[PDB]
């Protein structure tokens, strides 16, 4: 019986000392830092383990709408909307600081309360908007909500889409505070659970999400069973001359990024039909009954139809002898105006059964319905339009 | 050392040529591969003993 005690004693003592690289890189992990204004992010309010989204340094914006808009819509609607938002900051309205203080990040809980009127659970959504107005460090916060939601309405109408402008930035782990600016530390790639908090009293944290945007396609598809799940960031678009819509969702699903498109069609296909019908105003039609069909199937049969050789063409002696065909396209609702919900690769859960909770926390003293995720490993990806 | 001849003509040889030759060598490097399997590692280490 002594050799069984020796084999147990040997394996444990060998198991600690023979550990390679002294257990430094046993979790693979990465870290980011960036110094950004506390305008649209409140890391004091939004605690460690929330989503962050970066901007495009908004000087690009007001003429990209001049360049990429469909004809008939307004161009300066985006620039007039954005200038009122920088007015509502009342700190950096002077534009004189260049190169620094971008206010580049947007906290996820702020973006929920901007698009909050389009959700379903209004009682849950208004509780999110409460501590946005209450728990944030600033005055007239609801004025910023009304401008920035109008800006997102002005994003889709002036057709510079927010998913081309928004981009994933890593989740919060720690923040160092000062007036008007905070040193933000985040985790771009790797597991969320490996990130050292800095507080020895409270070790490793997790991902915190409001329950308004969290959607599980395990329920409405009826698909049970264990397995790994792919977290996603999904917007919603509704294009009309009316004031337009926006939503953000975080969808937990077993489906691949290559196969998400019929699933988002099953949810948001009602919104998909609308932006095909509407969203074409004012885009003027051509004159009615102008367009002919193709004689290409017809003229290819008869050898007596006049042709052209390579030496003939680009001469007007044969340009009149050939068939003349003038297509028109000014009344076409084409897919860039048929746009709707768009997604991106966000991260995966390597658990056998993915762990989700539904708790309420403060955010003193606002109690918010919150979904808590566990063991999130981050892999960002490209955006993808479902149009 | 270039060997020389005193030629019978009184015409001048004008110079002898004695110089140094320098040659850069070359370099090449050999290759091999030894590969071991998975379980062969732990048996040499002792993890499966």
């Amino acid at each position: 019986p002594n050799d069984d005690t020796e084999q147990a004693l040997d394996k444990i003592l060998r198991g600690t000392m023979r550990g390679g690289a002294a257990l430094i890189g046993s979790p693979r992990h990465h870290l980011t830092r960036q110094v950004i204004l506390t305008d649209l992010c409140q890391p004091n309010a939004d605690r460690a383990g929330t989503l962050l989204l970066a901007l495009r340094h908004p000087a690009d914006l007001p003429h990209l709408a001049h360049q990429r808009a469909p004809p008939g819509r307004q161009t300066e609607r985006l620039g007039e909307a954005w200038g009122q938002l920088m007015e509502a900051t009342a700190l950096g309205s002077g534009r004189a600081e260049s190169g620094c203080t971008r206010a580049g990040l947007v906290s996820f809980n702020f973006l929920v309360a901007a698009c909050a009127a389009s959700y379903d659970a209004r009682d849950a959504a208004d509780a999110v908007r409460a501590h946005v107005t209450a728990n944030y460090r600033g005055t007239r916060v609801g004025a910023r909500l009304d401008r920035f939601s109008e800006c997102l309405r002005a994003m889709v109408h002036t057709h510079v889409f927010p998913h081309e402008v928004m981009r994933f930035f890593g989740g919060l782990v720690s923040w160092v505070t000062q007036d008007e600016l905070a040193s933000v530390t985040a985790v771009c790639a790797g597991p969320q659970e490996a990130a050292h908090t800095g507080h020895p009293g409270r070790p490793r944290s997790a991902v915190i999400l409001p329950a308004c945007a969290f959607v599980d396609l395990d329920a409405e598809l009826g698909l049970g069973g264990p397995g790994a799940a792919f977290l996603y960031l999904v917007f919603t678009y509704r294009q009309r001359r009316d004031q337009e819509l926006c939503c953000v969702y975080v969808i937990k699903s077993q489906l691949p990024p290559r196969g998400l498109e019929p699933a988002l069609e099953r949810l948001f296909g009602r919104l998909r039909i609308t932006n095909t019908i509407h969203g074409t105003e004012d885009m003027t039609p051509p004159a009615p009954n102008r367009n002919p069909d193709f004689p290409l199937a017809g003229l290819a049969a008869n050898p007596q139809t006049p042709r052209c050789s390579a030496g003939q063409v680009t001469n007007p002696q044969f340009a009149d002898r050939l068939y003349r065909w003038q297509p028109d396209l000014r009344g076409r609702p084409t897919a860039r105006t048929c746009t709707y919900a768009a997604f991106a690769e966000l991260g995966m859960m390597p658990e056998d059964s993915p762990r989700c909770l539904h708790r309420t926390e403060r955010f003193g003293a606002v109690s918010v319905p919150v979904v808590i995720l566990e063991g999130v490993v981050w892999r960002p990806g490209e955006w993808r339009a479902c149009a | 050392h270039q060997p020389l001849i005193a030629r019978d003509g009184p015409h001048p040889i004008e110079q002898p040529t004695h110089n140094y030759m320098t040659k850069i060598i070359d370099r090449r490097a050999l290759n091999a591969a030894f590969s071991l399997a998975t379980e062969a590692i732990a048996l040499l280490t002792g993890e499966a003993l």
């Binding site: 360049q67 161009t75 196969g259 042709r307 390579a310 050939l322 297509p327 084409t334 | -």
Partner: protein
């Protein structure tokens, strides 16, 4: 990807005829479709019997949509009790390399992406049977990525003939002549392929495209002068015979043409739908080849080092 990776385990049932046990040890490197990324499954889940649809046996063209709904994984090592495999959509290993044995008629070159095709070709149709467990195993054929886009294009164009009451069978690559075995195609999945085409076909047509259509008389004049332009038309395109009859011309003038760029908007919409469509029919080329001791040709019937492709 984890620090150790993620390795699924496919358990083997205990009833095993010993010749079927040696048949599994020849499956050292193959590609296995998992339905989930569950850690423990069975061979009945992997095999062709669960891989059928409800009541209906899928054909070759309908088997492509069944692939992209599932998760391709590669067997690493055959154990006596279970089979250990690594998924491909999940980060594949601790080291970043897998061996893949070629069950393919065509050799491989370095750097080329690998997509994978059902057993399609004549003669080399090889399916491993586990007759003690009454199971059948149809394993996919890894192939280079421009070849897989040909074979999907040959199958889909064959089904469009069936809706219209010659010929399209023969392919070529590295000078090899090879045809493919197919008898019928179900009318269900062909409509799923065709609707995936024509929606992506339409979404390339924007206002700048009609301006590009005015350059059709320019190319047919330019193919007279340079043989590189003659490398386009190939006499089998529509546009050679389309330029011989139709002389199109531009519309004028475009609405809000000062603020916008119509030729630029037609290209970017074209790059996201028609140039995307090589991904939409088959599955993605997840894997390319990086030999380390440099072998320019990986021969048919041999393993190869394997590294992900973005």
């Amino acid at each position: 990807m984890l620090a150790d990776g993620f390795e699924t385990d496919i358990a083997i049932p205990s009833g095993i005829s010993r010749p079927d046990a040696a048949a599994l040890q020849r499956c050292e490197g193959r590609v296995v479709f998992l339905p989930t990324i569950r850690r423990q499954l069975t061979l009945a889940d992997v095999a062709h019997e669960s891989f059928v649809s409800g009541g209906v046996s899928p054909d070759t063209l309908g088997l492509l949509l069944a692939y992209r709904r599932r998760f391709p994984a590669v067997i690493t090592r055959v154990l006596p009790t279970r089979i250990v495999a690594c998924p491909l959509d999940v980060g594949l290993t601790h080291a970043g390399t897998v061996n893949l044995r070629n069950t393919s008629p065509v050799d491989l070159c370095n750097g080329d992406p690998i997509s994978l095709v059902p057993p399609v070709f004549e003669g080399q149709a090889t399916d491993v049977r586990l007759d003690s467990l009454d199971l059948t195993l149809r394993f996919p054929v890894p192939l280079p990525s421009p070849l897989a886009r040909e074979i999907v294009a040959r199958l889909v164009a064959r089904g469009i003939r069936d809706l219209n009451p010659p010929d399209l069978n023969v392919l070529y690559y590295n000078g090899s002549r090879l045809s493919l075995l197919a008898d019928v195609q179900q009318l269900g999945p062909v409509n799923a392929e065709l609707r995936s085409l024509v929606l992506n076909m339409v979404y390339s047509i924007t206002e700048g495209t009609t301006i590009i259509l005015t350059l059709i008389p320019r190319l047919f004049a330019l193919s007279a002068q340079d043989g590189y332009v003659n490398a386009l038309l190939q006499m089998q395109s529509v546009t050679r015979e389309a330029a011989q009859l139709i002389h199109p011309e531009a519309p004028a003038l475009m609405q809000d043409g000062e603020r916008r760029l119509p030729l630029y908007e037609a290209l970017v919409a074209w790059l996201t739908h028609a140039g995307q469509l090589g991904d939409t029919l088959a599955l993605a080329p997840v894997v390319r080849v990086c030999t380390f001791d440099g072998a320019a040709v990986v021969r048919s019937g041999d393993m190869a080092p394997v590294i992900r492709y973005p």
